[PDB]
RNA sequence: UACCUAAUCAGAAAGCCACGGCUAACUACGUGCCAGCAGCCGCGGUAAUACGUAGGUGGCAAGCGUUAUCCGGAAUUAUU
RNA sequence: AUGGAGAGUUUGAUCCUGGCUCAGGAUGAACGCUGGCGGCGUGCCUAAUACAUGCAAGUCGAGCGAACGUUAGCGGCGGACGGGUGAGUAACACGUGGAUAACCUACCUAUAAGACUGGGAUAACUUCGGGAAACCGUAGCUAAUACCGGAUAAUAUAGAAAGACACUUAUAGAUGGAUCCGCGCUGCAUUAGCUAGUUGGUAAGGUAACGGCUUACCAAGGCAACGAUGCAUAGCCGACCUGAGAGGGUGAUCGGCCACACUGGAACUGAGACACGGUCCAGACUCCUACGGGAGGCAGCAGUAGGGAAUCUUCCGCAAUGGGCGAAAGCCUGACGGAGCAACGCCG
RNA sequence: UAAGGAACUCGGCAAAAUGACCCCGUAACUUCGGGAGAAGGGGUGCUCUUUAGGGUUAACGCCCAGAAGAGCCGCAGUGAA
């Protein structure tokens, strides 16, 4: 009766539109592109702030994967 | 070549033959294999009437009505006692027991069991041999 | 949601409940995070409330309450009046 | 937290700074009672210190970073 | 144009897989037969199990033929191979399922049972 | 509606088995290699209390004979 | 050492090795029945026997649009968990430890956290051509503690939507899995052998991890007796008898785990599956029939059919013990409880 | 030469199938030679790249085709005998 999304939702969270997941994948496609082109998107590492007004304000990515890119960023400055 | 031996002969158990060749039988029809289920008694199909007249330590005309049981099996069965079933082509429980020194028949037949119970002549049993009608 | 669930384990029709820091998603035999000895409600011996929640003091700060509605069972374990 | 003492004898010796080491493990029959033995097989990243057939080596616990080498230590316990 | 010594492929699950025409019922002198005609044949190839065994004389009805029949409106409809269905005595299928399309000329032959099990009817 | 000493109406421990036995167990008839009995014994071609009925007897326990499943039996791939 | 241990069987009696015909208890039992009364328990043991069923479990504004605390239905939320039978892994799968330079640790509640910053808008409401149901058309919309990244803390040394008189980065309180070896695993004589990147080498990645995973290349009769490699196939354990101990057994229980969900196979946004009643694909099945369709738990309960010398009612309740919904309240439950059940042992 | 495929006939008589190269795969039996081309299953045109086979050759010029790809065309590529 109650839609499950806290227990075994491995395939329950993998059964709808992936447009937003694909759109977020295109935004994280410049991970090495901006680093190889020296973009200003990864500039000013005092913020990325990216822990005082980013994660909660507006964020929609992965966990461990993002954490890897959330280590060098938000701390470099 | 190079095919030598290492492991020697161990202490194997003596060869033995299972007794009562009529129990633990179950020929499959979907796999055509003997599906054992540890059954101490099967069914039967009385379709013959024996007449073992000559013998050795009997000095009397005996008999052995070969009755085919379940799992496509045929054994020389025999009805022990005076019970004379008059119902042919009918299931008959195979008495759980073999004969004693009787060349030919090597199995017994349970009295009654969805067939001719028997006669009320005897009344000293009141337990087996299709006994009934308890005298008062 | 993580209270002191009474682990119902032992023989049939007589489970020996043992108050332990368990979750609400794992009832009866689930997962104990902070075991608290065991409660004996046999009412035929002296040692009854033999709960050892010495390491369960950290549990009472972010997720700790009653699972099997045991107020008098937790009444003996008076570890409050200090906050 | 630290390392272990995987001291043993190196029998095989490959190239590209790679070689396997032999350990030792006791074994007894719980049902019977006869005492036997068994040797474990673990490779170790050595250079020239760890030899073979005699030269013993005291390998310590460390990052594997190999297909078989679980520990890496050139510390030799002997030299054939 | 199914005549004598003609091999057809059974289009049902009755056990048979191939039959051989033995005679075309309909009258003395009858040579060939088309869709909606009953014929006597023998099983030449059967599958393990089923109700019909090899070397059996049964009756079947044609449902598909290389040479298609002509309609009264001036239309035609030819198939790719000949096929039939082993029927009973009261025009009843001996199987339980039909495979492939079926001609709409079986509706005039009082074969509702066979025409109500065919996936397609054209 | 446990054990219950209470009203205290009268609501019933029978049984089946060996009985010459082996193995704690029987008398008369009827049988008489006809049938029964029938693990071990065997008892049936005449005096089978071994048979079948009656009076019974030894056992045990609300019952009794039966079928397939470990170990007393006994070391019996030995291992003591 | 609470300290086993009859015969026959062979002359006409015999000793002596040897094997069981045979002086007993046990008998998940049924049984032909003479089965007074009962506390307690097991009961398709014969049966992963086929399939009509009663049938999984409903909800919520402290945060929003009926006529009238949530009443409009969106959003928080077990269908995989209660369960069911155990053919299925001759083996870390379970039984059984430290552990992890094989390690992830999503997660569950407290405090930092100042309700910040880009927002339109969303189901209901409903403009709604038809269709036997077997589905397109005509389409505007309106919400809600539904809800949107960069510059100011975390491996540097390149913060929000709002609670009553909710809250978010950091993390704690807490939390689920992958792993090393030490432990359970048949023999073939009427088979006597098996791995070749078998045996070790490091580099394209990425997941609980090194990585013989592939990465460049690497040996001869080498591996293997440790029968590896073939089979045997079984759900594993905590257990009860047992020689008197020396020997020997080693699972019905009842819970953990490991499974399964017509048959397979490939994929599918929200918090830890292959899903006991979501997908698609195929196969042989289920049945009515508007020519199109629906498909099957009965592997949730109780039944019709199966052959069982050998086994539970298509009965009441959520007392309670539950947990999931859910400011309380509300609200859920063939989970579970109570009655039919047979000498199933009742011993008085 | 439409459907069919020995129903023809004393009898598959006479047609019709098969066929060259290349690659894979090959049974019973046996006097150990054989059976065996057993059976059976694939491939073949033209253009451009590569990097390489004996070379006429320094040469992989050029050419005989060795591989390895990428393309183009027809109903059909030992397109005939």
Quick one: three-class SS letters along A30-75?
CCCHHHHCCCCCCCCCCCCCCCCCCCCCCCCCCCHHHHHHHHHCCC
Reduce the DSSP state of residue A27 to 3 states and report it: helix
Distance CA B20, CA B106 (A): 9
CB E24 within 8 A of CB E60: no
The alpha-carbon radius of gyration of chain E (Å, integer) is: 14
**Å from the A56 CA to the G279 C1':** 34
Strand, coil or helix: what is A24? helix
Does the CB of B41 sit below 7 A from strand G? yes
Does residue E17 contact residue E10 with C-beta atoms inside 8 Å?
yes
Strand F bases with any atom < 7 A from protein Cβ: 15-17, 33-40, 44-45, 51-54, 64-69, 77-79
Bases in strand H with any atom closer than 7 Å to a protein CB? 2-7
Please state whether strand H lies within 7 Å of residue E42 at its CB atom. Answer: no
How is residue C82 annotated by DSSP? -
Q: Measured between alpha carbons, how far is B52 from B56 in angstroms, rounded to an integer?
A: 11
* Distance between CA atoms of residues A57 and A48, nearest Å: 14
Sequence-distant (6+) residues with CB within 8 A of A54 are A47, A48, A74
Distance CA C59, CA B22 (A): 68
Quick count: other Cβ atoms within 10 Å of Cβ E111?
21
Per-residue DSSP letter, B61:
-
Residue with token string 């998603």: C25
Nearest Cα neighbor of B102 from B56, B59, B133, B37 is B56
Tokens representing B29? 């029809």
Nearest Cα residue to B58 out of B106, B95, B101? B101
C31 touches strand G (CB under 7 A): yes
D57 vs D71: CA distance, rounded Å:
12
Strand blocks (E) in chain B: 45-46, 67-69, 73-75
| Sign, CA torsion A25/A27/A28/A29 | positive
Tokens of E84: 């039939």
* Phi, psi (deg, nearest 5) at residue A36: -85, -15
Pairing of strands D25-28, D35-38: antiparallel
Residue A37 CA to residue A43 CA, distance in Å, equals 12
Task: Give the helix/strand (H/E) hosting E29.
Answer: none
Does residue E1 reach within 7 angstroms of strand H, measured from its CB?
yes
Question: Looking up tokens 């997962």, which residue turns up?
Answer: C31
Beta bridge partners of E40: E23, E59
CA at C63, C1' at H35: how many angstroms apart? 88
Q: Which residue is nearest to nucleotide G168 (CA to C1')?
A: A56
State which H helix or E strand residue C74 sits in: helix C71-75
User: What class, spelled out in words, does domain E1-122 have in CATH?
Assistant: mainly beta
Enter the DSSP assignment of C43: S
Q: Tell me which DSSP letter residue B70 carries.
A: T
Query: Whole-angstrom Cα distance, residue B55 to residue B99?
Result: 14
Q: By C-alpha distance, which of E90, E89, E91, E116 is closest to E104? A: E116
Please report how many Cα atoms fall inside a 13 Å half-sphere around the Cα of residue E49, on the Cβ side: 4
CB D73 within 8 A of CB D58: yes
Count of all residues that appear for chain B in the document: 136
Task: Give the residue among C36, C45, C44 at the shortest CA–CA distance from C77.
Answer: C36
> CA-to-CA distance for B41 and B70, rounded, in angstroms?
10
**Residue B22 CB contacts under 8 Å (≥ 6 apart), including other chains:** B42, B69, B73, B75, B94, B107
Q: Which residue has the closest alpha carbon to F42 C1'?
A: B57
- For strand G, list residues 22-61 of chain A whose Cβ lies within 7 Å of it: 27, 41-60
Q: How many helices (H) and strands (E) does chain E have?
A: 1, 9
Q: Residue B3 CA to G231 C1' — how many Å? A: 21
CA-CA distances (angstroms) from residue B117 to B129, B133, E86? Answer: 8, 12, 50
- Is residue A39 a contact partner of residue A30, using CB atoms and an 8 Å limit? yes
Residue C65 CA to nucleotide G165 C1', Å?
25
Give me the DSSP letters along E66-83: SS-EE-TTS-EE--SS-E
C-alpha pair distances (Å), B29 with each of B72, C51, E50: 11, 62, 15
Q: Using CA atoms in the order D52, D57, D62, D67, what is the torsion angle rounded to 10 degrees?
A: 20
Q: What is the CA radius of gyration of chain B?
A: 21
List subunits contacting chain E, requiring 3 or more Cβ pairs under 8 Å.
none
Q: Which residues make Cβ contacts (< 8 Å) with residue B129, sequence separation at least 6?
A: B81, B83, B111, B118, B122
Element (H, E) at E8: strand E7-10
Name the CA radius of gyration of chain A, rounded. Answer: 16
Q: Which experimental technique did the depositors report for determining this structure?
A: cryo-EM
CB D50 within 8 A of CB D74: yes
């Amino acid at each position: 009766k109650s839609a499950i999304k806290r227990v075994k939702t491995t395939e329950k969270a993998e059964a709808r539109n992936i447009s937003q997941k694909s759109a977020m994948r295109t935004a994280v496609k410049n991970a090495k592109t901006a680093v190889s082109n020296n973009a200003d998107n990864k500039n000013e590492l005092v913020s990325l702030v990216k822990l005082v007004d980013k994660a909660a304000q507006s964020n929609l990515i992965h966990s461990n994967k993002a954490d890897r890119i959330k280590s060098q960023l938000m701390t470099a400055n | 070549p190079t095919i030598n031996q290492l492991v020697r002969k161990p202490r194997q158990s003596k060869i033995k033959k299972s007794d009562s060749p009529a129990l633990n039988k179950g020929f499959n029809s979907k796999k055509k294999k003997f599906t054992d289920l540890n059954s101490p008694q099967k069914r039967g199909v009385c379709t013959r009437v024996g007449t073992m007249t000559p013998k050795k330590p009997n000095s009397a005309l005996r008999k052995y009505a070969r009755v085919r049981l379940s799992n496509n099996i045929e054994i020389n069965a025999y009805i022990p006692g005076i019970g004379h079933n008059l119902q042919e082509h009918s299931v008959v429980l195979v008495r759980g027991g073999r004969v004693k020194d009787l060349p030919g028949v090597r199995y017994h037949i349970v009295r009654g069991a969805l067939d001719t119970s028997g006669v009320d002549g005897r009344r000293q049993g009141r337990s087996l041999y299709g006994t009934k009608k308890p005298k008062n | 949601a993580v209270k002191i669930r009474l682990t119902r384990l032992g023989s049939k029709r007589n489970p020996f409940y043992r108050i332990v820091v368990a979750d609400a998603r794992s009832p009866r035999d689930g997962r104990i995070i902070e075991q608290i000895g065991t409660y004996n409600p046999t009412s035929a011996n002296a040692p009854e409330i033999k709960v050892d929640e010495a390491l369960a003091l950290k549990w009472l700060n972010d997720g700790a309450k009653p699972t099997d509605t045991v107020h008098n069972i937790l009444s003996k374990e008076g570890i409050m009046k200090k906050f | 937290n630290d390392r272990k003492v995987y001291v043993g004898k190196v029998v095989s010796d490959k190239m590209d700074k790679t070689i396997t080491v032999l350990v030792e493990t006791y074994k007894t029959h719980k049902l019977y009672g006869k005492r036997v033995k068994y040797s474990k097989k673990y490779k170790t990243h050595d250079e020239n210190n760890s030899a073979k057939l005699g030269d013993i080596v005291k390998i310590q616990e460390t990052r594997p970073l190999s297909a078989t080498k679980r520990f890496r230590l050139v510390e030799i316990v002997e030299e054939s | 144009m199914i005549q004598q010594e003609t091999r057809l492929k059974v289009a049902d699950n009755s056990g048979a897989r191939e039959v051989l025409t033995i005679k075309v019922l309909g009258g003395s002198g009858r040579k060939t037969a088309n869709i909606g005609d009953v014929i006597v044949c023998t099983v030449k190839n059967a599958t393990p199990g089923g109700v019909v065994k090899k070397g059996d004389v049964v009756k079947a009805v044609i449902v598909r033929t290389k040479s298609g029949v002509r309609r009264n409106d001036g239309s035609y409809i030819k198939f790719d191979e000949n096929a039939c269905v082993i029927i009973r005595d009261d025009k009843g299928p001996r199987g339980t399922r039909i495979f492939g399309p079926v001609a709409r000329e079986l509706r005039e032959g009082n074969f509702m049972k066979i025409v109500s099990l065919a996936p397609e009817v054209l």
